[PDB]
Design a protein around this ligand. Structure first.
Ligand SMILES: NC(=O)c1ccc[n+]([C@@H]2O[C@H](COP(=O)([O-])OP(=O)(O)OC[C@H]3O[C@@H](n4cnc5c(N)ncnc54)[C@H](OP(=O)(O)O)[C@@H]3O)[C@@H](O)[C@H]2O)c1
Ligand SMILES: NC(=O)c1ccc[n+]([C@@H]2O[C@H](COP(=O)([O-])OP(=O)(O)OC[C@H]3O[C@@H](n4cnc5c(N)ncnc54)[C@H](OP(=O)(O)O)[C@@H]3O)[C@@H](O)[C@H]2O)c1
Ligand SMILES: NC(=O)c1ccc[n+]([C@@H]2O[C@H](COP(=O)([O-])OP(=O)(O)OC[C@H]3O[C@@H](n4cnc5c(N)ncnc54)[C@H](OP(=O)(O)O)[C@@H]3O)[C@@H](O)[C@H]2O)c1
Lengths: 326, 119, 69, 326, 326
């Protein structure tokens, strides 16, 4: 219904759909495609773009940066996020130490050709760095105006709660967002644990992989298509998931869901993406796309949203059989 | 061990989260129940209530179930607090009988419910 | 619900503003009356008075009118 | 009596009259007129100049900036204020989010050709942004030395109190000023609610629209003169007020007040402006003027100030009939 | 076992061996040797390089800086530390006053040709400067991003505890590290007092002079070799130690230790350096070397580390006779 929404309880307003740059930018797709993909997302009102130092060893950032600079879009109209954790081969080039958060963000910001990102994320938790150091560094880079806000990714509730608690202890800035995985086959965290953090400390969920890497598109029904992600060099891990006992158990479930899709008169991907947004707990879904067809289709998930009755939902829940007890 | 700040009308109490998890049906033991009193700005639970009582309420959890009315807190007041904090009817009756109040020198079902001949 | 800090000789008390609005003729209930004791630096009302007593004074408001020494 | 006065309890000293730039600068009047208008105000001792990102879509700021730079006035002799809230068509270009306060003020400051403003204002309250984020952003831009101080505009007492309270909570900077509407037909807030905040937390009132957009000048007695504000493209809202049942009820009241004006040997506008300053609760009145005649006349309100006996005041109160019970 | 380890409990990761620049850089050895020495240490995985404003009156810093800039090593892969206390002949050019910490670090940073060091150290305690001023200055330079972290050198536990305590008092940054002397003939502090601070407040020991200035190499058995440190102009103090009653008492003890060395099939220096790392309390040992032979040998201490059984240790303890009662 509402295309824009507060990221958690922060005053930051995001389109309910964002465009990511994992696998694709500076990697799988060309820069021409990337530009086209961004221009499309932007012209349809998407203001949220997610990247990371790790993606294509910085190249995703270079490309995203170039597009922004080429199109001459007003910075105030964009919400750019980047994630920090893996920034190089040297020992001190990874993690959430003050040294890496600073050096990492600075390197990212340079590649992006931006003075700041809107949200900077801890890309995963760091058992080797005290919370206090991490929260201080995040608070430092915001105060340096290198970020507007900060967020966590793949942290547990306790980890997020701890970060928040430490911020209140030392009068620092709490995180506003957790970037968590969410699709029909990965629900536990976003559906049980995150809403409690949202109500308690106002942290919002910005979710990733709504098509579970393309799996939910159904395209893997008969195996590994050429030019699919599972087919790419260095995605054997995914190919293995897809062709596993559990991977197949899933594709069987897709066939049933496909029935529900044709009934609402939409594609399966649209249903799945729309399914992720079905609850106000989720602030935005980060899309992935290797072409303009995939993206324009995915944007269509929004039209599906009011078609998701509580009965269509209970129906999907039955076929999936993976609704987590709260 | 994660810790909890409970603020009873400005009087700050601190305990561990597991100390409270020891009685999950009580208000403070139940996340959904206490969620309503949480102050995100201060990272504490605020209760606009009786200060002298809470001392014992928190010690109940720490002691693993001892519930004694502080000698300086009236009976009617302290009882209301036990009721609010939802300590439970078991803990409540143990307090009732420890406080010095006996209602059942009884056989449980005889005196009250009795006779099967409606007549 | 806006909240109020009352500082009785270093001993900090906290209540809701509506809890005090329940007795508008009393000093603490009356904005014009208590205005004199407000510390803008600390955002609290300071009273250089008896500590052991205030406990009951504040409970009077919370209890809806119970006043016990 | 005292031409300069502390803005609230801050150490900032303002002329009891300021010159605004709403409607006029970069809009209704020419840049030549604007320059002349500023030079006049300045040479008569006015140091207070108010603008906003919203005004003429930034153009008021461009013009005010040019004048300052042309005249080569010493920055330390000027008190420049700007308001932030509506800064563009994109979703993230409005409100009091950290992102917009920063990007907004920065854009303003660039247009103005200044390194900082003296006071930056929340142009209205923002229900979609937590107080903490707003107070932090305001405190951030002051620490960046992009503003000397910050203020609220059109906030309620509770909203101002909340901002103050949050500042004390997190050891941030409370606001020093509320920019509120005040004229003979809009009194409630400035006369009842603001003095309590002044005595309690030292917030001062810097008031706007002393002539209720020209209405109080009496010029609308017989309708809509050509080249009057009500006649301008996009001020139909005002034309409608002027020609309403209540709008007319007012103009009738002006005719009576006009008697009091000729008795004190001053114009009606001078009485009204002087009437706003009659109480030490009001720190400054922001004037509007489309010509030098209007401005030089309005500055004359000061001579009227000692002529305002408590009996002249009770008299005005009777004819108006709108004195708010405290 | 683990070549990299957290410096104390900070997220900063250091090689268990670092390379210092005392006596050698810009002093005893040539810049060609210095470069070669650094390139060697670096290519063997050492990321830790220690210097000081005092060393060769700034020249050590100039040389270390040049090498870094010549080799074009990525800054994020290096951990540069410098110590501050003695920065010149004028009264205000020494100590831990806000003035000197700032001016001192800034001067160092300029010489180094770096924007920041990773850790800045109080080079010794300052009885003439209140703790609060020192902790504030250290916290200031970190916030200015002139250092990532700060540390103490030659402070007592109480002094370190006091610095920590003051940081918590005023919400500043506690120190992460004490740079203390540690070798077989100087054990008391690192072995008794520092582990308590590590467990309590997470301060790590980065130790210096593992060969007690070359003494532990055994090279002084028959006196003062030419081109040895004790032979250098301005190291008479050391020559005197070496040829003292106690200095000789020690060299006799080296001869016994040499037996243990040939038994483990390593040199004496390797044993001693490895001996310093034997306990997880020590985060890094700062090496000194006047040639590439000395350095490549010293790096070999790591291979010796698993050969240090608790019985080899008790054996060394007996011959030394200086194990401190805890
Ligand atoms: N916080 C984190 O740790 C984290 C982790 C991962 C990702 N992310 C972010 O989240 C974003 C999510 O991206 P994702 O890769 O996970 O997205 P996804 O929705 O799970 O999958 C997108 C991929 O599936 C295929 N696909 C997309 N739309 C399709 C359609 N309509 N029909 C058929 N196939 C379609 C596409 O190309 P193919 O042809 O190659 O299959 C695309 O690359 C990333 O870009 C990244 O920014 C964050
Ligand atoms: N904080 C806020 O949300 C807020 C809101 C509004 C304004 N403000 C500020 O406050 C300032 C107040 O300006 P305003 O427009 O409200 O002022 P005003 O005093 O209510 O009216 C000024 C307008 O009335 C007419 N006028 C002025 N003097 C006159 C005179 N002596 N005789 C006859 N007509 C006269 C002028 O031109 P015409 O010929 O066109 O009528 C002028 O444009 C603004 O410039 C702005 O900076 C702030
Ligand atoms: N925090 C502080 O107050 C403080 C104080 C002192 C030092 N430090 C730091 O710690 C580092 C430690 O250096 P250090 O000078 O104390 O080191 P050391 O290990 O005690 O001695 C190194 C010196 O001994 C000789 N040597 C080194 N390896 C040898 C080997 N394998 N065989 C024979 N001789 C060998 C070398 O040259 P020669 O031929 O000239 O003997 C070298 O200059 C310094 O560079 C400095 O950065 C800090």
């Amino acid at each position: 219904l509402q295309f824009y929404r507060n990221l958690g309880k922060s005053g930051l307003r995001v389109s309910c759909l964002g465009l990511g740059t994992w696998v694709t930018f500076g990697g799988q797709i060309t820069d021409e495609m990337a530009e086209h993909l961004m221009t499309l997302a932007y012209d349809n009102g998407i203001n949220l773009f997610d990247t990371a130092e790790v993606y294509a060893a910085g190249k995703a950032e270079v490309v995203l940066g170039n597009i922004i600079k080429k199109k001459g879009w007003r910075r105030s109209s964009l919400v750019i996020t980047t994630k920090i954790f893996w920034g190089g081969k040297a020992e001190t080039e990874r993690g959430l130490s003050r040294k890496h958060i600073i050096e990492g963000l600075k390197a990212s910001l340079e590649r992006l050709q931006l003075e700041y990102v809107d949200v900077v994320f801890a890309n995963r938790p760091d058992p080797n760095t005290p919370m206090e150091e991490t929260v201080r560094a995040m608070t430092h880079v915001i105060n340096q105006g290198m970020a507007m806000y900060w967020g966590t990714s793949r942290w547990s509730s306790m980890e997020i709660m701890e970060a928040y608690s430490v911020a209140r202890q030392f009068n620092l800035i709490p995180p506003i967002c957790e970037q968590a995985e969410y699709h029909m086959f990965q629900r536990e965290k976003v559906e049980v644990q995150l809403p409690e953090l949202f109500h308690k400390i106002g942290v919002g969920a910005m979710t990733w992989s709504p098509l579970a890497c393309g799996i939910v598109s159904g395209k893997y029904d008969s195996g590994i298509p050429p030019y699919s992600r599972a087919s790419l060099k260095g995605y054997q891990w995914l190919k293995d998931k897809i062709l596993s006992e559990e991977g197949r158990r899933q594709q069987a479930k897709l066939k049933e869901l496909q029935a529900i899709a044709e009934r609402l008169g939409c594609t399966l991907p649209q249903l799945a993406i729309a399914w992720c947004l079905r609850n106000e707990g989720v602030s935005s879904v980060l899309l992935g796309a290797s072409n303009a067809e995939q993206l324009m289709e995915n944007i269509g998930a929004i039209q599906v949203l009011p078609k998701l009755s509580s009965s269509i939902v209970h129906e999907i829940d039955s076929i999936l059989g993976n609704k987590p007890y709260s | 061990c994660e810790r909890v700040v409970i603020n009873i009308s400005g009087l700050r109490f601190e305990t561990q989260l597991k100390t409270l998890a020891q009685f999950p049906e009580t208000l403070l033991g139940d996340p959904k129940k206490r969620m309503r009193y949480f102050d995100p700005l201060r990272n504490e639970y605020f209760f606009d209530r009786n200060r002298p009582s809470f001392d014992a309420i928190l010690y109940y959890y720490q002691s693993g179930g001892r519930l004694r009315r502080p000698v300086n807190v009236p009976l009617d007041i302290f009882s209301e607090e036990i009721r609010f904090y939802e300590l439970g009817e078991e803990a409540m009756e143990m307090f009732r009988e420890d406080e010095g109040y006996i209602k059942e020198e009884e056989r449980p079902l005889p005196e009250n419910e009795f006779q099967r001949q409606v007549w």
